[PDB]
């Protein structure tokens, strides 16, 4: 299972911090606000919502999902975590380098004879986590800091661009 059931509580304002999108007759997380019950419950970009308050989200539109959220008395959702992502693990070389070139959080090149080359990292993929930290929405400069500063093993989770583009 990638599946968990989580309960959340609305903020003093009454909102939980989510924006959701319909993709392929499914519902996915398009934005999570920081420090918001949604973020606090572990929701991340690209997470899939199976049921809200027990009601299947299948065939829902983003609008219907939001409305269900606004109108409920106190909230439980069934989530399949990050169904669109893959895990690739790389080890830095003596030079300290794992082998790839990226822009805007999207991998654009693979160095030859690099852990990335050894491990079959692909182009056109966005990097959604490095070593347990979400990088989504983070400036390449901040992403680099996580990367240089990182331990010799590098674990990152990627998503293909076609999907990432749909989610936003």
């Amino acid at each position: 299972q990638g599946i968990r059931e989580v309960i959340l509580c609305k903020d003093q304002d009454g909102k939980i911090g989510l924006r959701l999108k319909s993709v392929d007759n499914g519902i996915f997380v398009q934005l999570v606000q920081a420090n918001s019950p949604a973020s606090l419950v572990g929701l991340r970009f690209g997470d899939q919502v199976l049921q809200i308050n027990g009601e299947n989200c299948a065939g829902w539109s983003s609008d219907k999902a939001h409305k269900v959220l606004k109108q409920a008395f106190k909230i439980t959702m069934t989530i399949r975590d990050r169904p669109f992502e893959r895990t690739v693990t790389m080890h830095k070389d003596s030079s300290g380098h794992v082998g790839f070139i990226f822009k805007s959080g999207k991998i654009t090149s693979i160095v030859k004879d690099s852990s990335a080359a050894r491990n079959g990292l692909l182009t056109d993929h966005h990097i959604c986590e490095i070593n347990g930290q979400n990088v989504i929405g983070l400036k390449d400069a901040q992403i680099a800091d996580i990367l240089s500063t990182a331990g010799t093993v590098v674990t990152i989770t990627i998503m293909p661009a076609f999907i990432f583009e749909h989610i936003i």
């Binding site: 790839f100 070139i101 822009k103 160095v111 390449d140 400069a141």
Partner: peptide, 8 residues
């Protein structure tokens, strides 16, 4: 123009 890419 700069390509503004980063490598790791």
């Amino acid at each position: 123009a700069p390509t503004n890419e980063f490598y790791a």
